[PDB]
Design a protein around this ligand. Structure first.
Ligand SMILES: C=C1[C@H](O)CC(=C/C=C2\CCC[C@]3(C)[C@@H]([C@H](C)[C@H](CCO)CCCCCC)CC[C@@H]23)C[C@H]1O
Lengths: 11, 240
């Protein structure tokens, strides 16, 4: 976490 | 007193919201179907709505003047701790006092206490959520106040785990003063009466609702057969 989905929606 | 840097912030936040909130609710047909009449009948459909809503709150948050300047770690922390609260806030736009339900176009997508109850929440813990929607709806906020309140909620420096709290506060103050100044200059009496203070009070009530949500989501998610029905974004954002 390491939350890759959130980080990707963030840019 | 409405400085130009402020009317810009407002325009940014309105355009942000317009780009992340479809009042037609067209996308809801992609969600797993709603089921009324067994246990947790509504969970798949509402898990989809929440997950969608989280996406939309992220696209909103990214346009917040200043948000960009934070570390990716701070952005994550802010969003993880506010998502549910911004979801509760943005839902006010579809919530109606006519029958205390969230009316999203059609009866298929019109949610009341019973529906929420069939998503794994007792009718007892749902009531304060309704009382929150009622008192927020009565403020009759201008759309400008609405988006400012969501942005102020996201950029809160006291969220646990925040690194550069100093900068979060700096960004939030810019937005607070914008709202305070917006109300004085643009919001006529008597609706403006202490409207700021009452807006900030809703942010306090949302903290309480957040805590209650976390506790209830902890119990629900701890049942792996229920957590199976969630989405990957919800698991990631609300926890596993
Ligand atoms: C586009 C939107 C429309 O206005 C429709 C909408 C409605 C929001 C709703 C209506 C259905 C029920 C929702 C999704 C709530 C969900 C089920 C919450 C569970 C999320 O894990 C219920 C928590 C309440 C207990 C804590 C006090 C939280 C917010 C509730 C969400 C919004 O994003």
């Amino acid at each position: 976490k390491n939350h890759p989905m959130l980080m990707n929606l963030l840019k | 007193k409405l400085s130009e840097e402020q009317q810009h912030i407002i325009a940014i936040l309105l355009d942000a919201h317009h780009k992340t909130y479809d009042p037609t609710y067209a996308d809801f047909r992609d969600f797993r179907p709603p089921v009324r009449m067994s246990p947790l009948s509504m969970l798949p459909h509402l898990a989809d709505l929440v997950s969608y809503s989280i996406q939309k709150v992220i696209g909103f948050a990214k346009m917040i003047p200043g948000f960009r300047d934070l570390t990716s770690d701070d952005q994550i922390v802010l969003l993880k701790s506010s998502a549910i609260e911004v979801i509760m806030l943005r839902s006010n736009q579809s919530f109606t006092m006519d029958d205390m339900s969230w009316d999203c176009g059609s009866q298929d997508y019109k949610y009341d206490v019973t529906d929420v109850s069939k998503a794994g929440h007792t009718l007892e813990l749902i009531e304060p959520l309704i009382k929150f929607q009622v008192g927020l709806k009565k403020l009759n906020l201008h759309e400008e106040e609405h988006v400012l309140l969501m942005a102020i909620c996201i950029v809160s420096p006291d969220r646990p785990g925040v690194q550069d709290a100093k900068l979060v506060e700096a960004i939030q103050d810019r937005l607070s003063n914008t709202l305070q100044t917006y109300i004085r200059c643009r919001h006529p009496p008597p609706g403006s009466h202490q409207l700021y203070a009452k807006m900030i009070q809703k942010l306090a009530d949302l903290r309480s609702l957040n805590e209650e949500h976390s506790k209830q989501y902890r119990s629900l998610s701890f049942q792996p057969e229920n957590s199976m029905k969630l989405t990957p974004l919800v698991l990631e954002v609300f926890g596993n």
